[PDB]
Design a binder for this molecule. Sequence first.
Ligand SMILES: CCCCCCCCCCCCCCCC(=O)O
Ligand SMILES: CCCCCCCCCCCCCCCC(=O)O
Length: 111
Amino acid sequence: MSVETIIERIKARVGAVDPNGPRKVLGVFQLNIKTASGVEQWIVDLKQLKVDQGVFASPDVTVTVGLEDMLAISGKTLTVGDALKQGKIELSGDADLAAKLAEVIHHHHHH
Ligand SMILES: CCCCCCCCCCCCCCCC(=O)O
Ligand SMILES: CCCCCCCCCCCCCCCC(=O)O
């Protein structure tokens, strides 16, 4: 139930995205999860819908979230909306590109 379990859900979703929901998008996301030994970098592209480790040469958006914060969402226990207000996720670059994504996250549980 670590960062691996959190991303495991994304990598599966990104490669499972349906043309009925979203649409041909473009850009990149830089997810940063806090840790006891530092922070884990991640690159989430929207052009081809994929995910990678580390940091991109220059992401269009930079997301900053803590471990507990992520586990809360991916754990289906909490919603991005709540954490959003609390200030769990930081916005760097284009709050739109990031906010738009959360839209797909804020939904019914069990997923
Ligand atoms: C940096 C934010 C944390 C990780 C983001 C989880 C990504 C979930 C799946 C991405 C695709 C969902 C949006 C559909 C349109 C698209 O982006 O192609
Ligand atoms: C600023 C808006 C961006 C919203 C990003 C939500 C915080 C990071 C991603 C949350 C956990 C995502 C892991 C599972 C995939 C999903 O269901 O979204």
